[PDB]
Design a protein around this nucleic acid. Sequence first.
RNA 1: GUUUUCGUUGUUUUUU
Lengths: 88, 48, 49, 64, 102, 511, 45, 214, 96
Amino acid sequence: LKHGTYEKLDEDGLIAPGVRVSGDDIIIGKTTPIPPYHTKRDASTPLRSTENGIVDQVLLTTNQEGLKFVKVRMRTTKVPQIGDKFAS
Amino acid sequence: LIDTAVKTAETGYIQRRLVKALEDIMVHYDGTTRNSLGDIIQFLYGED
Amino acid sequence: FGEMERDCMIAHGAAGFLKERLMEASDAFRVHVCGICGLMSVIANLKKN
Amino acid sequence: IKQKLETQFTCLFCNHDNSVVCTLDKKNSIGLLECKKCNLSFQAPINSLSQPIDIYSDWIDACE
Amino acid sequence: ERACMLCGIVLPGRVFMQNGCPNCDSVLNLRDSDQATVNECTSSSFEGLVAVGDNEHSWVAKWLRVDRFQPGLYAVRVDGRLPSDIVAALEQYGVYYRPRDG
Amino acid sequence: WEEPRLILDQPAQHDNINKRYEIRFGKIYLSRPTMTEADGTTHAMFPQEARLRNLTYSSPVYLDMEKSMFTSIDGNKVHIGKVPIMLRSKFCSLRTLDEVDLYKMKECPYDMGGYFVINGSEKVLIAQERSAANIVQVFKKAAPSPISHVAEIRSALEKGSRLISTMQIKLYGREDKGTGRTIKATLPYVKQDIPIVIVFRALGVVPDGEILQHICYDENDWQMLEMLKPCIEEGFVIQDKEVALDFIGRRGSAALGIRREKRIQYAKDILQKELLPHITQEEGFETRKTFFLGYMVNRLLLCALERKDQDDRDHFGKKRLDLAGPLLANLFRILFRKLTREIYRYMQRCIETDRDFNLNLAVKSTTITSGLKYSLATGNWGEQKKAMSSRAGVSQVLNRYTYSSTLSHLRRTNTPIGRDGKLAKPRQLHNTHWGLVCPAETPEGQACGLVKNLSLLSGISIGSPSEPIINFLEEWGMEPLEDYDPAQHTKSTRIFVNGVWTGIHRDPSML
Amino acid sequence: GVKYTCGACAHNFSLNKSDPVRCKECGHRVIYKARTKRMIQFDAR
Amino acid sequence: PQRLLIPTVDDPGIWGVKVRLGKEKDVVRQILKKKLAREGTKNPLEIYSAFQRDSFKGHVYIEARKAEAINDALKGNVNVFSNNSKFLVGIVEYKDLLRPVKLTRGSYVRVKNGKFKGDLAQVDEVLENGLEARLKLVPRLDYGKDLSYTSKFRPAQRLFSEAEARVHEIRRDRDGFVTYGGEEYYEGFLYKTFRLQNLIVNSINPTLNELSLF
Amino acid sequence: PPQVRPSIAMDETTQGQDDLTHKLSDILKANINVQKLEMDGSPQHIINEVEQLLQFHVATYMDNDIAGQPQALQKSGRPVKAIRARLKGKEGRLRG
RNA sequence: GUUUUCGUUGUUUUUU
Ligand SMILES: [Mg+2]
Ligand SMILES: [Zn+2]
Ligand SMILES: [Zn+2]
Ligand SMILES: [Zn+2]
Ligand SMILES: [Zn+2]
């Protein structure tokens, strides 16, 4: 598994929209079986360690092959700060 | 702007080649200037 | 670490920092070599020594 | 200056490829060909615009 | 395309179901026997694809014994072995079958 | 219809019967977007749907087949795949719907399409510029070479908008060095150069009088006569079309053993075919080719004399931007040619079984689909097996970081000249972009000065049929090229349409 | 169990990771999850 | 005795033109039918036989006498390399071109095709025709743990026992002989109708598991 | 050793063998094919061709920048990365 | 209970 946490995940392996998020946080809970008990492996999606915010919009749909296919949008404000660039 | 873009790269190439040319030369306790092989370049650094 | 960086700090001549930085802060490694052939063809085990 | 040319051209008699030697001799405007297997030779006038390929073409046009 | 045991001529399997072996059917009766006999006399596994168009003077024909046989596709090697009945009939009629797989 | 017939045969003597299994192709049929769900359900799409579920905004396409039998004893709407469709286009599901249903389908009106949606990814093509083809181009070659001036042209068929070949000429001999000032030509599918007089003689005008007429038109220009004189002197061995042709056919880069029987005919073929196909591709107009060649060599000699400026290669009016039209045309052309190859072959190892193929089990539309998909998604304008020698970066991911970035992104060009050799002419701005590309906007460093942008008033031609122009010229006393005399029409105007010599006229002002 | 909602008809429905994911009410082939049940804060700065 | 039928100079020569890979049989049959149809015509083909061998893949050899006959034969055939990559066949190798060139019961063999591939077997019966043979393997069954196969998801092998089959999930004909699931099991081993194609006996070296078991 | 030419995992578990291992296996196959030639029909020209291909494989596995002859590749259309290619270049072991 | 891991190679873009 990942050094990040999994509690914010949902009972299905997802995360509710509008949930606070920190970097290195597992946002998508996916698993894969192990070729032959205890025959599965982590296939999760930790959030970018440098990126934090809140979940904007959680999509769950099937890809062209019909397999479950999610598109997860996170969001956050970008506040101008010392050294941030501006131009005329 | 074109000339600047060309010149920076070409000059960088020249600098790289030159630094490779003279990367080992040293002044020594004798005050001579010799290479890694020890062949003296100058009998005295800057003659001074 | 850039080539011109090596060039500049050699113009300075910070030999010790150079060696450690290129060793400690990079992929340092230890091996064993047979002097007779002078090559790294040694068959070594430690606990058996 | 003579120029012996051990070419890749195939000769019709002994049917061996690279057996045709197209030695061009422009001195008299008269060509020369040799085979190392059946020793067949061909003759043809050679202008300032003739080549071993043109010589082989002339040979095919003449023999057959 | 099943390679005939005796002569070696090969034709699409439909050909043997319907048109038969040009030379061996007289003694092998592939057209007029159960498909078991056809397959045993003509195996689906073969090797040494030899196309023969002229056999009267071809050295390949003399080696392959198809100088008399109709020109066509021939297989040098045929695996397996003939069952008892086919070879027994061949030897009764005077046809000493020579396996060509060696 | 560029490749409208596949002809097969079967001379089976098992009784000589010629079973010609010929295949013809019907009209092209284009559908609107309609995907198939893994549930099997099919529905017309919308770009945003693909964006959400990572699909490609493409429309199924049908072409009509035709299987015809010609057995002498002596089709259907086939789904060929789905073609990605640029949004808002006549085949676009968003072209209509006005301002309102775009809201219902959650579409920003301020988008103007112009891009391609692939697997939910909006992709934008980058147009490539190029000099105009079939133009005479004389240049001063580097002095350290026997060649002094190089006349160049890449002949391409006007129909199909596709390159065919190129021919180049060179002024052999240096100023009083290299013996005389001779000229030899370079040809497609050859291996050597040939004296220009020889290629004149193989094309019909063996005598040098006609050659000079077609070449020199001011006989007072004795200077021209004496520069060409060594060319005339060296052109005395060949005196008829057949010797000139076999001579030429001897250097046709072909196999060995063609003998003069077929060598002359192959030489005449390459004189006709592969040679100025844009001028003519059939017989009886080799005179037109001779006249055009004489004009081109006359231009070359004028340039050698340097009485005229060397054609500024940077003069932008010669440059030409290939819109998506020619690009996709060539891509689908090669893909359809591969499809033709594979289907015609499958006919071969499926007609042997003499099974009445359904024209369905034979065809796998995956070829065109996957080929276009790769060439676009990865941007390589070429097959996945010809990645090298294939122009990459033609298609790019669009820019939506800000509005105007996208805007320029839709008004950007490309210069496929390569970064090999720094040089200054290309990146340098030239007066001949006046009002054509954004003078100030340009990339930085490697891309600076080469990629360009449509000026706010620059407009791109889509192409028009030319024959009505021919009629207008014919309508107005067009003087043919065969009625062209160096002395008579000494002040007349040579006529050119789409850049090729299309007649003579004496009073051009009124017309 | 978990509460979802359609994008077209605007109806909430719950699947239990057993039904193939399709709109329970208008067949629209794109669903979404709902807000969480925990409380949210904002510094309003 | 074929040795008196050895080739000689008087016999027609052989020109070996290589063709596109996998299309050599195509060229052989093309030449055959082209020769048959053009036999007796005003432009006859001086080719006596055409043949291809498995070892010399991509190599096609035609018995002829003149290069013109070969040139006309291969003319109109696209499956042939554009090159005239042909080398005259010497006297000795004419027969070596057509030269054709072990299995017994109780011999160790390996499986290739299907799902039971890579499992050593011991032949115990051979069909009369010489096409199919029966074996002696180690049965590989999941005992219903995943039934409600492929060649890459299997666990290790174990010798068959009656108690495990009885408990986990079965017709007892002879002592130790049970035909279960369309498969024969004698002495706790595996018997099945395995094609002669699916098996090979030559050049097999037993492995650590095999020496532990066999 | 495998340390030089280990396994690269294009996608998590899916590992594409390092091209060095690929060409090593290729050269071993060519060697064995030459080995498989002589005990059976090996009519000289076949031996010459097979050994020529083996030499081509060895040279490519050494270098693919051999002037006057085209490069070696994989099924992807990508030319093989010869050892020299690994070694030289601005990103080579030395410079890189 | 200590302990403990994500890919490549390309491409194109900009960043000075
Ligand atoms: Mg800056
Ligand atoms: Zn040692
Ligand atoms: Zn000879
Ligand atoms: Zn028979
Ligand atoms: Zn709904």
